[PDB]
Design a protein around this ligand. Structure first.
Ligand SMILES: CC(C)[C@@H](O)C(=O)NCc1cccc(-n2ncc(-c3cc4cnccc4[nH]3)c2O)c1
Ligand SMILES: [Ca+2]
Ligand SMILES: [Cl-]
Ligand SMILES: [Cl-]
Lengths: 57, 247
């Protein structure tokens, strides 16, 4: 459930009827096969700081 | 910003500077290549709506380094519920005339989904506030962008520890050392969650800055996600100022 620990989602979380949950990602991200993690799909995704992301690559 | 530090160049890449006839007006936050979020009150005294400029990639106001990108403000959208000269509903959505170009120094802040913001981000204790505002109460504004980490208060705790409506939240410190200040309004209150930063507040206003006994007041962006998203899907309208129904 999305209200506890964000449903285990890195970003956005929807509840569905049942014990079902779907995570989703902002534009410029895609959801990995874990069903929870979001990875950028563009060079300048929202909410990341390029000079810090390049300091850690 | 009182009691913060210089934001290292490029570390606040969503920060906007708003100018009117070249003069500092307010801050803002880039959320897409054409859309900036700011505070409604920043526009209470505008006469010439056609001379508003947004600058992205700014850092040191004394120099041009080539990372800055300036754009004309094409539309200023304010909720119908906002009353000039007051605090409640203090938000504006600004459409740029032409997109900015995303670069290492120009990057949007993520506008979160409402549920996520209410269920998750609202419980992250510390967030960053930034701007070129006054460095002290009754003091000069900053020439380099400043940033401050502030903790958020639940509104019941704000009131006890000090109107704060459901469209606002408090954050900061009651000992007069650390606050956002005049010149910072409109800028971001940005919250980190699992490796990404999100917009959770807008620097609003009140009586003084870093006043002992008082916390900073921020517009509660989670209340406006749907309003914002709908407007971003709409066509532009002639005339810069648009009042849009809220909710
Ligand atoms: C009455 C009218 C002549 C006059 O008030 C007017 O010019 N209104 C428009 C206008 C346009 C931009 C900024 C401001 N403006 N003035 C004060 C503050 C301000 C104080 C403050 C304290 N703590 C955090 C943020 C804070 N911000 C501010 O943002 C007003
Ligand atoms: Ca500069
Ligand atoms: Cl439309
Ligand atoms: Cl006009």
């Amino acid at each position: 459930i999305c209200v506890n620990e964000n449903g285990g989602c890195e970003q956005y979380c929807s509840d569905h009827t049942g014990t079902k949950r779907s995570c989703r990602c902002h534009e410029g991200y895609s959801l990995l096969a874990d069903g929870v993690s979001c990875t950028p799909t563009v060079e300048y995704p929202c909410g990341k700081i390029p000079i810090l992301e390049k300091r850690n690559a | 910003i009182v009691g913060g530090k210089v934001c290292p160049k490029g570390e606040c890449p969503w920060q906007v500077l708003l100018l009117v006839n070249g003069a500092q007006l307010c801050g803002g936050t880039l959320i897409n290549t054409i859309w900036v979020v700011s505070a409604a009150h920043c526009f209470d005294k505008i006469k010439n709506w056609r001379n508003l400029i947004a600058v992205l990639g700014e850092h040191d106001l004394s120099e041009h380094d080539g990372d800055e990108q300036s754009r004309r403000v094409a539309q200023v959208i304010i909720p119908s519920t906002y009353v000039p000269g007051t605090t409640n509903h203090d938000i504006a959505l600004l459409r740029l005339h032409q997109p900015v170009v995303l670069t290492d120094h120009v990057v949007p802040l993520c506008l979160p989904e409402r549920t996520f913001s209410e269920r998750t981000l609202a419980f992250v204790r510390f967030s960053l506030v930034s701007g070129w505002g006054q460095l002290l109460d009754r003091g000069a504004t900053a020439l380099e962008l400043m940033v401050l980490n502030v903790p958020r208060l639940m509104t019941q705790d704000c009131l006890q520890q000090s109107n704060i409506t459901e469209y606002m939240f408090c954050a900061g410190y009651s000992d007069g050392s650390k606050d956002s200040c005049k010149g910072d309004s409109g800028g971001p209150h940005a919250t980190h969650y699992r490796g990404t930063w999100y917009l959770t507040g807008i620097v609003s206003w009140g009586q003084g800055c870093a006043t002992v006994g008082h916390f900073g007041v921020y517009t509660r962006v989670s209340q406006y996600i749907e309003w914002l998203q709908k407007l971003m899907r709409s066509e532009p309208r002639p005339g810069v100022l648009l009042r849009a129904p809220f909710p």
